[PDB]
Amino acid sequence: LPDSVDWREKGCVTEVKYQGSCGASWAFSAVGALEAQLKLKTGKLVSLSAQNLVDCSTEKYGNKGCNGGFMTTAFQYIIDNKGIDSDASYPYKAMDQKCQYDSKYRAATCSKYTELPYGREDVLKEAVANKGPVSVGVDARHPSFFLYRSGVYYEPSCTQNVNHGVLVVGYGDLNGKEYWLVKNSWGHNFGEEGYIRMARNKGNHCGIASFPSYPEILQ
C-alpha cells in the first residue's frame, strides 16, 4: 500500500558487504533478509555470518559455497541447525572452509521461509511492504550491471533468468520512473553506496520477481 518503502529508514539493513572473489551472493542475500526479521522481532540489528552459510549449508542443501547456492535452502539450513552465528563471531573470508558453527554465538533463528509467485511484481511489492526485505535473484550477467553507477537501471537485453542473488529492501520512483531498492554484496563502491535501483513494473525486468523468498522469526 505505501507508494514507497526503504527499510534502512527503520534500521533493518546492515552495512553493505564485499563478497570478493567468492561466489556467495546467495549467502549474503539470505542473511540480509534474516537480519531484517531480527530487528523487527527483537529490536537489534546485527550482521549474520555469510561464512556460516558457505561453510555449513552445503551438499544436503544443494549449495556449493563460493561456486553457487540458493537462498531458500540456506533458510532451510538455519531452520535445521536451530540458529546462525553473528558475522562478528564467524567472519567471512571469501573462501570455502570447514563448517565451524558454534551454537555459543548463535545470533538468529529461522522458523520458516516463503517463496513468492514467479514474476508477480504486485505480490513482491506486498511482501516488501508488509513482511520486510525480500531475497531475490536477478539477471546481473550484462555489462551494464557491472558498469552501473547510479539512477534507475534498465537493460533491454535483460532476461528473466536470474544468476545473482541480492536483497530487495524497498521500492519507489525517480520522478515517476519506478524502481526496486536493491542491496547488493559488492561493497559500497558499487552502485549507490552499495545499492542499485532496478526498474520496477517493467515485466519482471532482469527477473527480479522470478524467485523471491523471505524468512520469518515466529512467536
Ligand X SMILES: CS(=O)(=O)N1CCc2c(c(-c3ccc(Cl)c(CCc4ccc(Cl)c(CNCc5ccccc5)c4)c3)nn2CCCN2CCOCC2)C1
Q: Which residues bind ligand X (CB under 6 A)?
A: 23, 26, 62, 68, 70, 72-73, 137, 140-141, 161-165, 210-211
Q: Which CB sits closer to ligand X, 54 or 107? A: 54
**How many other C-beta atoms can be found within 10 angstroms of the C-beta atom of residue 54?**
29
Q: Which CB sits closer to ligand X, 81 or 107? A: 81
Largest separation between any pair of C-alpha atoms in the chain? 49
Q: Which CB sits closer to ligand X, 24 or 48? A: 24
| d(C-alpha 186, C-alpha 76), whole Å | 25
How many CA atoms lie within 13 Å of 173's alpha carbon, on the beta-carbon side?
8
Least Å from the CB of residue 90 to ligand X = 22
Least Å from the CB of residue 11 to ligand X = 26
Q: Which CB sits closer to ligand X, 50 or 140? A: 140
Q: Which CB sits closer to ligand X, 68 or 172? A: 68
Least Å from the CB of residue 10 to ligand X = 25
| d(C-alpha 184, C-alpha 187), whole Å | 8
End-to-end CA separation in angstroms for the chain: 25
Least Å from the CB of residue 137 to ligand X = 3
Q: Which CB sits closer to ligand X, 107 or 139? A: 139
Least Å from the CB of residue 216 to ligand X = 19
Least Å from the CB of residue 63 to ligand X = 8
